Amino acid sequence: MPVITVNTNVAEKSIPVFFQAALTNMMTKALQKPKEVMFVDLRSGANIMMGGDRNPCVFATVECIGRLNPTSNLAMARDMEDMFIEHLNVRRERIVIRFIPVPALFCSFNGALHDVSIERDEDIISQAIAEYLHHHHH
Amino acid sequence: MPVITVNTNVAEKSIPVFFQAALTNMMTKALQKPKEVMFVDLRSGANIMMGGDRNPCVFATVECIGRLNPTSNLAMARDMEDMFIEHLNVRRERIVIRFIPVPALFCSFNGALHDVSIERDEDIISQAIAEYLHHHHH
Amino acid sequence: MPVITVNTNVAEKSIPVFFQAALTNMMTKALQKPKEVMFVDLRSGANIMMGGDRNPCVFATVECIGRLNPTSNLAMARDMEDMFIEHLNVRRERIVIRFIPVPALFCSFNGALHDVSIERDEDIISQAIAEYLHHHHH
Numbered sequence A, B, C: 001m002p003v004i005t006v007n008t009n010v011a012e013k014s015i016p017v018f019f020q021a022a023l024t025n026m027m028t029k030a031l032q033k034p035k036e037v038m039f040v041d042l043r044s045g046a047n048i049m050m051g052g053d054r055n056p057c058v059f060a061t062v063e064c065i066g067r068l069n070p071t072s073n074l075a076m077a078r079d080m081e082d083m084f085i086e087h088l089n090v091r092r093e094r095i096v097i098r099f100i101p102v103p104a105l106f107c108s109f110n111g112a113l114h115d116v117s118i119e120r121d122e123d124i125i126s127q128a129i130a131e132y133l134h135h136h137h138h
Ligand SMILES: [Cl-]
Pocket: A100, B100, C100
């Protein structure tokens, strides 16, 4: 699924040419999905304002089929936040990320819908079961 | 309701001047709603990347009050996809469309909310019943 | 939470320099949240078309943690609408606002998630109870 969208007022000319590629590789591992279907939409130098002022501020969204829940959400947000403060030089008291759960049958990749089984993170549970066996009875 | 949003890295200068009007008329019929309330937001030459590369790639969204479900979703996605490959010259293994169901009482067109009855596709069922009668007992 | 996003084809050069600050202060009071965490993303001179024509048209979204419901939604929409007609010189039969309810544990502000209690508007009920007592038994 994944679609990481970053709206910031930070001007593109102040953005490391390798930011979208770093974020791409970070969220590919984070959401445990193929790198081939990971979008990163940078909206740099956006006419965005937060709190009525115009400092380094960011509003990011993560669209994902499954993977998203309170425990993982917070983890990802922290990582995205840390990656914004250091590379976009924003703040952390000026960053809001919204995680958007996407129904599998409401999302069309390559002339087909998604598997509802992945929306229920069933591929991870089955990995959980696999790794269990290995180092719980070889 | 309808709001078709297309984020592509394809430069506006390579976009048929009649693309937004074609897509507009396609999705007006598809979602069975007035053409007057159909938005098409083209975000051409967007700083969007998919898979860490920068080929012809697309992330479209369809915001609709009702109409949206697994069977119609897939149909629309296919049509939108076909309309992107030929007019935006993207790919099909580089297109992801997200269908977003919109609550009728969470969407304000012209100083009023929407009818919850349309969110439940009750105008189509009633059309279904009408056409039934016609060619099932004149 | 709040994130007010305005996509209009109205050119930035025709937008009062104080529009985003007016809308910011309006929706800060409306959604009863700190002004510090209110985003306004203006997408002026957007390649957006509605009805297949290119008049003054607007598609706004309100992302909020709680606050949003049929009675308040309509109120806000009316106010936003009135603020678009007069300052963006759009129409009112050319404005659609979508209110998006945001799960508190699916939204990360400043290295933490949001309080689920605010998503249930429990801070307002408690204010309701407080003010009740005052002018119902001093
Ligand atoms: Cl959404």
